Design a protein around this ligand. Structure first.
Ligand SMILES: O=P(O)(O)OC[C@H]1O[C@@H](O)[C@H](O)[C@@H](O)[C@H]1O
Length: 468
């Protein structure tokens, strides 16, 4: 009497080059911003990470043992072009071909992302994507990869553009560690999206065989008190900063009137200017209907309350329940509802928000075509016991969301797969190695993998499609 998922659903796992790989200075790998940054601003580094560079056969064998039929992986732009452009690093390219081969061998379909929070340092320190020159460097890097890896049937350009501008120019937790720059945020959202529109046009023109799409973070924004118009407006603007702006570029080819009115407002109150060239809209309009699927990364929702004070944002990275604080002048502040389960990192559990996002994209952008939940998971300090982890909380979190998908599917939403963040334990960019999300437990001192209770649960799900 439980829900069921379509027989052709993808039950995958997700990873990220920098988070998983390791080998940060091996086989010609070029530096990335995180190299110096984590060292100066955090208490851990990307070494040894989960040593994916050498472990992948074990990871893939296990992934196969436990019914995982898909896997998001990212190509480390700085491993192919250790400087963003020019010389190619043979060994880098060699590595990916191996990896890709192992995937096909293990029946795990690779969903490849060209960019996942890791612009080659040399280019990043030069304005990253705010600098229009790097847009070029990207398209060339994409064309290289498209041509070089015919083994890949599914491509994605960028992973979470919103969260890049957010952690980079708004929260200041991702390098360069800038804060409150709502002008840079919106610019980066526009520039990066132009970089995407171009690469997709390109993959389509040169008529390659597979599918090309985007991976967007879409945390549902709700007004704290639906009855208060002040709250409604607040969620609306908040949603515009994190979701609408980007979505619109991804489908309308331009920013809607409400979107620009809100952006105008936000920028007026906080200052700032946007450099929007007409050629950018030619690129955007061209690729608007090209995307083959949408990848929705979703972890939690946000409630917004009106707020008239100055802007202050504190990121709770050590996992101290309550240290999070988010308020923006002209926009509003986030207030967790009273009794929703939230965690030590303050991330709110609210499965219903996923359903609402899926019905929103579906209604506002009917041309989405197909939806994959490219990332969903619960990060928390598991306890290593009996060579496993009795991660019942994670099974509950996942199970709850999978049920909401099973519904959004029934209600006419074209959802084709779910990717659990993450396949194995990896360190978090701003929360260290403590915030674990994996189906498999990595013992960072030995690099030994151990299936968690969720790995065993996911298997039955995989081979039954009955959520129980
Ligand atoms: O902030 P956390 O704990 O790392 O969880 C956030 C996760 O979200 C995903 O969407 C990002 O692409 C991952 O790289 C990961 O960072």
């Amino acid at each position: 009497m439980t829900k069921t998922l379509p027989k052709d659903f993808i039950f995958g796992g997700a990873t990220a080059a920098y988070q998983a790989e390791g080998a940060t200075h091996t086989d010609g790998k070029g530096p990335v911003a995180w190299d110096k940054y984590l060292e100066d601003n955090y208490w851990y580094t990307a070494e040894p990470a989960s040593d994916f560079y050498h472990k992948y056969p074990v990871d893939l064998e296990l992934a196969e043992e436990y019914g995982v039929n898909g896997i998001r992986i990212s190509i480390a732009w700085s491993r192919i072009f250790p400087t963003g452009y020019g010389e190619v690093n043979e060994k880098g390219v060699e590595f990916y071909h191996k990896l890709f081969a192992e995937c096909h061998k293990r029946h795990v379909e690779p969903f490849v992302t060209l960019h996942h929070f890791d612009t080659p340092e040399a280019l990043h320190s030069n304005g990253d994507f705010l600098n229009r020159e790097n847009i070029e460097h990207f398209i060339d890097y994409a064309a290289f990869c498209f041509e070089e890896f015919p083994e890949v049937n599914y491509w994605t350009t960028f992973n979470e553009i919103g969260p890049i501008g957010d952690g980079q120019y708004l929260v200041g937790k991702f390098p360069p560690g800038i804060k409150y720059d709502l002008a840079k945020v919106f610019q980066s959202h526009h520039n990066m999206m132009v970089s995407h529109a171009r690469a997709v046009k390109l993959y389509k023109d040169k008529g390659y065989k597979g599918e090309i799409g985007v991976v967007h973070a879409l945390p549902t924004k709700y007004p704290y008190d639906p009855e208060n118009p002040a709250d409604v407006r607040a969620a609306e603007l908040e949603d515009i900063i994190h979701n609408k702006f980007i979505l619109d570029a991804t489908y309308l080819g331009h920013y809607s009137d409400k979107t620009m009115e809100g952006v105008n407002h936000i920028l007026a109150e906080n200052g700032g200017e946007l450099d929007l060239r007409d050629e950018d809209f030619q690129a955007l309009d061209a690729a608007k209907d090209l995307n083959d699927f949408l990848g929705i990364n979703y972890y939690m929702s946000d409630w917004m309350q009106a707020f008239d004070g100055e802007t202050e944002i504190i990121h709770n990275g050590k996992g101290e329940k309550g240290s999070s604080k988010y308020q923006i002048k002209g926009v509003g502040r986030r207030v967790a509802p009273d009794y929703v389960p939230r965690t030590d990192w303050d991330w709110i559990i609210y499965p219903e928000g996923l359903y609402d996002q899926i019905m929103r994209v579906k209604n506002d952008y009917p041309n989405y075509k197909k939806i994959y939940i490219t990332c969903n998971g619960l990060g928390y300090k598991d306890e290593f016991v009996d060579n496993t982890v009795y991660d019942d909380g994670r099974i509950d979190y996942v199970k709850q969301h999978l049920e909401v998908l099973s519904d959004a599917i029934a209600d006419g939403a074209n959802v084709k797969g779910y990717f659990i963040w993450s396949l194995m334990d990896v360190f978090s960019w701003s929360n260290g190695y403590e915030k674990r999300y994996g189906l498999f437990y990595v013992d960072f001192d030995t690099q030994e993998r151990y299936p968690k209770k969720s790995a065993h649960w996911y298997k039955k799900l995989a081979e039954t499609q009955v959520i129980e």
